[PDB]
């Protein structure tokens, strides 16, 4: 029940309480294990606990599958520093070490309670008799597919070994399955469910992407007479907040082109708000200095071309991102603290066409490669969804939820459409007239 999970949290991990109630619900659902689970939480949200705490509380070994060996080593170290009994059956181990590990596996009530195995090693003939022993003895309790998104072809990463991990899942049928993902998409979710042969009922635990602290709104540079003036005014308003409190926090403005990035930085500096380009091409020393001074309170705002502060007052995308997932990740840092923060998008027809041409060129190169075509299809679909969101009429949080597959949000406040639906209607009518 709750007491056992709380004791495990306080003893093994040390956390006083669950970070989010959704994490608690997912952990309890996995602990029960009645129906296959699919967890989709962002990095640092504690998703690893969802499959770790039940393993510590489960009976017998749990097999965890990860894409890379370095990730397995990192997880093993993280579990070892907590004095947890974790094992890894990988070819990198020595003959004596692997012999000892297999001997422990053969013995009843194996000491190891969580075994990290690469999918190839599990599918390799060497471990097949061990898996046969496991099925005979019913040792395995949960089958955890970490980074399950690799199975979906539409995902950014493709792992051919997960397609065989699905056949493995067909075997060892008694044990439930838990698929973990960082960012999920309804198409990717369906691909994961179908490829891994999960039971039709699936407990889906996905964090809501919308932020009640954050305010979304889209502007069009063609309509505004002076886009730079609007940018400066919005940046000053967000940073200034109350007059008596004074300027607080630091904002981030995302740039597409290096020349445009430095132009925006210098123009903001001239207007009255100092900024640092933080361009990728900038040498390492200057990049470190600008990153520092932005982390320090000295610099009001920073411009970023590739990429954190505890409090971020505003986030303005001068140019549209390559994919809605990228835009959402970039804007997530907007007001990571509890104080109100706003985001802006300066969507433009010319910039949109230019980035669409870039995406088309990238897709053409990928097709010339002749591999990962579904990845190119997913990328172009994501870009189309992002541009539609820019042109969409309705709640911004609602459109983001529709894309990511999140449930529709109750954005009573902090939504452009909610506050002034008539203003949004007029703005889109003006855009249509201009175009």
């Amino acid at each position, epitope marked *: 029940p709750e007491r056992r999970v709380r004791s495990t949290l306080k003893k093994v991990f040390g956390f006083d309480s669950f970070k989010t*109630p*959704l994490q608690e*619900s997912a952990t309890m659902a996995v602990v029960k294990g009645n129906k296959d689970v*699919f967890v989709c939480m962002p990095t640092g949200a504690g998703k690893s606990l969802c499959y770790q705490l039940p393993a510590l509380l489960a009976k017998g070994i749990t097999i965890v599958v990860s894409p890379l060996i370095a990730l397995i080593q990192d997880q093993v170290d993280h579990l070892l520093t907590l004095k947890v009994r974790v094992s890894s059956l990988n070819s990198k181990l020595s003959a004596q070490e692997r012999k000892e590990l297999l001997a422990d596996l053969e013995r009843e009530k194996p000491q190891t309670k969580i075994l990290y195995i690469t999918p190839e090693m599990a599918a390799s003939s060497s471990f097949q008799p061990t898996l046969n022993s496991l099925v005979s003895r019913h040792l395995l309790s949960y089958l955890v597919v970490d980074e399950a998104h690799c199975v979906s072809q539409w995902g950014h990463d493709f792992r051919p070994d997960y397609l065989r991990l699905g056949a493995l899942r067909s075997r060892l049928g008694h044990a439930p399955c838990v698929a973990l993902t960082a960012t999920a998409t*309804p198409q990717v*979710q*369906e691909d994961v*469910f179908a490829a891994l042969h999960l039971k*039709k*009922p*699936v*407990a*889906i*635990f*996905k*964090t*809501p992407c919308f932020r009640a602290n954050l305010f979304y709104d889209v502007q069009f540079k063609e309509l505004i007479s002076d886009p730079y003036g609007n940018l400066k005014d919005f940046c000053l308003k967000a940073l200034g907040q109350e007059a008596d409190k004074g300027l607080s926090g630091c904002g981030i403005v995302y740039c597409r082109t290096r020349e445009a990035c430095e132009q925006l930085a210098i123009e903001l500096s001239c207007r009255g708000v100092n900024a640092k380009a933080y361009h990728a091409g900038l040498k390492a020393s200057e990049r470190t200095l600008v990153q520092n001074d932005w982390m320090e309170e000295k610099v009001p705002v920073i411009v970023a071309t590739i990429s954190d502060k505890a409090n971020v007052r505003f986030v303005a995308h001068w140019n549209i991102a390559k994919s809605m997932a990228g835009y959402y990740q970039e804007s997530g840092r907007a007001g990571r603290d509890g104080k109100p923060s706003w985001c802006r998008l300066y969507y433009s027809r010319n910039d949109r066409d230019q980035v669409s041409f870039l995406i088309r060129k990238e897709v053409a190169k990928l097709q010339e490669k002749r591999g990962n075509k579904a990845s190119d299809k997913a990328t172009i679909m994501a870009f189309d969804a992002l541009v539609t969101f820019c042109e969409e009429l309705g709640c911004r949080h609602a459109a983001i939820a529709k894309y990511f*597959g*999140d*449930a*529709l*949000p*109750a954005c009573a406040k902090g939504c452009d459409h909610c506050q002034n639906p008539t203003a949004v209607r007029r703005r889109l009518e003006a855009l249509e007239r201009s175009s």
Partner: nanobody, 124 residues
Framework: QVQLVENGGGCVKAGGSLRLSCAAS????????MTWYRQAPGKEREWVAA???????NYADSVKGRFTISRDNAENTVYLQMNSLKPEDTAVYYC???????????????????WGQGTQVMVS
């Protein structure tokens, strides 16, 4: 959960036309596909029509011409129109409603599929 409700079952003489309605309730983000199943007494259930997200339609050769399948995603309601009906097509109908993805504002959801209660039909 999702409660699928059937409607429109009516007695039509041979050559008569009738519409079977299948409405899904609760909170659904999307339905993968809705398939009708004509299950005659003393016989094996036979697939009739299939509608998938996006509007792709599949029909069985027996019902290729006479039956038609449509769906509204705004209401999550799938309809089957039956024209030039024959005495052969006298059997109960159901809805598979495969791939029902439900969610909540908190984020907890379900993926199981739900089946309709069923609707009747006759031919003179």
């Amino acid at each position: 959960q999702v409660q699928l409700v059937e409607n429109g079952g009516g007695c039509v003489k041979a050559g008569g036309s009738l519409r079977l309605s299948c409405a899904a309730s609760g909170s659904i983000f999307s339905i993968n596909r809705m398939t009708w199943y004509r299950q005659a007494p003393g016989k094996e259930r036979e697939w009739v029509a299939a509608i998938t997200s996006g509007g792709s339609t599949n029909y069985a050769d027996s019902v290729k011409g006479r039956f038609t399948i449509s769906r509204d995603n705004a209401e999550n309601t799938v309809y089957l129109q039956m024209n030039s009906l024959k005495p052969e097509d006298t059997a109960v109908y159901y809805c598979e409603a495969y791939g029902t993805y439900t969610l909540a504002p908190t984020g907890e959801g379900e993926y199981d599929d739900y089946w309709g209660q069923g609707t009747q039909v006759m031919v003179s």
